[PDB]
Design a protein around this nucleic acid. Sequence first.
RNA 1: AUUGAAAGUUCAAAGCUUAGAUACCCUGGAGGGAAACCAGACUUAACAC
Length: 95
Amino acid sequence: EELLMSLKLKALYPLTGGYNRHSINPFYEELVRPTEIKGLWRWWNRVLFNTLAYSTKGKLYTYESIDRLFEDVFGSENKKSAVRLEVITDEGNDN
RNA sequence: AUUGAAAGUUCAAAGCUUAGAUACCCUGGAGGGAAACCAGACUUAACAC
C-alpha cells in the first residue's frame, strides 16, 4: 500500500537454491529469493522475541504462539501479511 | 245432533347449453482461488601420527 523502507544489501557467496537446489536453472537465474528473506525474517523474529522474553520474564514461548502474536505484520492463514517484500537484484534480467 | 259429510296440490318435466387457467415475465444482481510457508540441515568414517 505504501513503501515503508528500502535496504540496499550485499550478500557474499550466496548459495541460494531453487527447485533444482541451485541459484540457476534452464529457465531463470535467481540469486536472492524473497520467500527465503521472509522466512528468515520470521525465524530471526522468533529468536529475538524469545531472547527478549527470557531476558525479562525467563519464559520461552512456542514458535506457533509467537507467530500467532505477530500475525498482524507477518500474516497467517487467517490474515494477509501487512508487509510486502520486493527484492530487486540489479542485473536481474533474463539469464 | 256443527253453513255439515265426502275429496292426496296430484300428474309429466335431466340445472342443462356454449366456454382452452390463459396472457405478459432472462435465475438475475453483488462477490479477487485467495491467505500462510527459508530448498534447507549437517559433515562423518578409516588407518597413519
